[PDB]
Design a protein around this ligand. Structure first.
Ligand SMILES: N[C@@H](CCCC[NH3+])C(=O)O
Lengths: 388, 402
């Protein structure tokens, strides 16, 4: 059987997909009795140079040339983008074409509507390559952005300011000139949306993820956390309780003994809680060749071509920084004991001149508003995780 | 239009019982969903007079494996018996008789999986052994793992609570982690089996159990741990496979791990596999071992997979990725010497004079007239060399994460 495919996009991932198919073509014929023909490649601009170099494939700038080709069996999309890309994929599925996508901009809303449209039209939608950082899961926590983690590691290990650490990340290639997507936690929040969809089968919106970036984390925060037994990481978290997902991305104190506390520099990790023990997956972000390899894997799966469950038969902790405090640390601790609702434990630390930090274990919600209404100036509050 | 899938179970221990319960509890669902009716037609047991729960008495129990192997109505054989002989021959026969085989046999090694996988492909049927391995998975060049929960638990206890090996092992016994004869754990045999398996899955190479150079943890002392600690290292029992120049070098032994390495943080009964490759970053998988219900659940999962693809990937197939063209190691040692006269400065100076070229050397007090050295960047163990220069070498552990 000839399997006629088209590629939408030819960047590093697209080029990699092509090379992998070329290199394995004879093997795929001999083994699976399938002949993969790349009949069209959509590119934005036919003139640009590429890792493929000058090649033998038909390049087009007109997507309709691909979407109207009824001889196509499978569309491989490596273009990125939501518009017009998602509409292209909707058309392909409506035309009874299998779709494999490595589109990093897709969110849960998009994957859901594409998965349904695929099922509806009797074809496959594969998005394995779209994720890169895969059992009743109740909670996950992750370090999901390499650049922000790199910055925090640098601040921590080398005792530099955020500004110095970000400049170093810029010169080393990790951060871009406008590093907002990394530093403000947007990239991490996207991965929290995707991870929540995969873990809980629930669709949340990007703006449902309560998000704070790292630009306000200081050495003082890091060193106070250190003395209390914690590192600071930008943590993306999803908690699935009572039919609802609470999702967030924010600077978080993590107990030094926690597996996540050791994840440094540009490495990422996803820590999954469920019943069973915890599990964790650790590694850097893929990986053009890895992404390309995952696409081709999904491709062979579809070429070799529903669900899933089976037989059954928590408080929060907080790091609070308060400024303009008159009086001693002992007095502050006593006042805090008097003000707080019932909780499990409290420790206080010096933070700066007339500033103290408290870690409070076992509250239902942030004591920020409460402490504010009692007349204190709260600088900020970070969650605390890994507490045993 | 419902198709009956006739299966047999070889063995009915905790895993076998769990497999049965899971199938029972999900039977209606598997019919309604996949339009498949799973019928457990035979269960092989060692002793069929033995009293069993009521649910088991509904099934046909036999002590004669041939009754199962000769039953042409069987579609799938699920083996949860364990053992190499006669168990592997049973599975060979099943495959030759065109029966799919799902196994959770914990005694299977690479030699066995290889011959069964080939025999399966050869006969147009599936061999599934997912349940035979505990989770936590292209060009992998090296892996390092903490592969035995009990030994890791013991080392964590020694380290955190400052106990001797003997005290930590007794505690592991009392707490349920170690068994009464803990040899398989403590001597690193279990870990060596997993290194054979991990090497087969990572490198597609078959090694024998006796090719794995093995040392357990029973000789690790609190002094080793505390001296390692002061030098910046933890001690773990590490199972390692290095694939260099067509050959696998495989080992299990006490190993100093830099405290900043991801493996250093893996404590208690948790396991982890750390995987290194060209040209991607390192990866690691972390979690505890199975798990009778988990093993049983994995068997049933493999079962449904074989059911779904029943009416329809060759083991020989590997995706070539030498378009890495288009897109684009030394050893370290911890050496303990005893009966050393003279100062630590003198020991360090002598080592500097006698060692071949290396990246760094640090020395520490170990005990009375005993010193330890960590040496980074040698081509091979300096043990013989140090011995011929008149030092009593107590032992040498590899050092990783440097
Ligand atoms: N305390 C023992 C530990 C055994 C190490 C064996 N390699 C000794 O003196 O060697």
């Amino acid at each position: 059987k000839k399997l006629n495919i088209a590629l939408l996009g030819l960047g590093t991932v697209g080029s990699g997909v092509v090379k992998i198919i070329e290199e394995n073509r004879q093997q795929i014929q001999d083994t699976l009795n399938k002949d993969i023909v790349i009949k069209h490649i959509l590119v934005r601009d036919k003139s640009k140079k590429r890792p493929l170099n000058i090649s033998q494939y038909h390049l087009t700038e007109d997507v309709n040339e691909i979407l109207n080709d009824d001889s196509l069996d499978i569309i491989v999309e490596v273009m990125g983008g939501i518009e017009p890309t998602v509409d292209w994929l909707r058309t392909a599925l409506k035309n009874k074409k299998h779709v494999i996508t490595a589109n990093k901009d897709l969110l849960a809303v998009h994957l859901k509507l594409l998965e349904d449209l695929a099922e509806e039209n009797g074809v496959a939608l594969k998005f394995e390559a779209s994720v890169a950082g895969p059992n009743n899961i109740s909670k996950f926590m992750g370090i999901l952005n390499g650049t922000s983690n790199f910055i925090l590691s640098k601040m921590t290990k080398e005792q530099t300011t955020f500004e110095e650490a970000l400049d170093e990340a810029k010169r080393l290639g990790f951060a871009e000139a406008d590093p907002t997507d990394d530093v403000e936690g947007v990239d991490a929040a996207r991965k929290v949306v995707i991870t929540s969809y995969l873990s809980f089968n629930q669709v949340i919106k990007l703006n449902d993820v309560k998000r704070r970036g790292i630009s306000g984390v200081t050495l003082t925060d890091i060193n106070v956390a250190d003395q209390l037994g914690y590192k600071i990481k930008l943590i993306g978290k999803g908690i699935y309780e009572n039919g609802k997902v609470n999702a967030s991305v924010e600077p978080t104190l993590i107990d030094k003994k926690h597996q996540l506390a050791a994840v440094e520099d540009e490495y990422n990790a996803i820590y999954v809680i469920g019943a069973v023990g915890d599990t964790m997956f650790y590694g850097k972000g893929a990986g053009s060749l890895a992404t390309g390899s995952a696409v081709v894997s999904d491709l062979l799966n579809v070429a070799l071509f529903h669900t899933p469950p089976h037989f059954e038969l928590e408080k929060s902790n907080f790091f609070v920084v308060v400024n303009h405090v008159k009086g001693s640390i002992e007095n502050f601790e006593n006042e805090l004991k008097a003000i707080l609702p019932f909780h499990r434990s409290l420790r206080v630390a010096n933070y700066d001149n007339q500033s103290y930090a408290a870690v409070i274990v076992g509250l239902e919600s942030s004591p920020e508003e409460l402490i504010t209404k009692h007349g204190y100036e709260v600088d900020k509050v970070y969650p605390v995780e890994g507490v045993l």
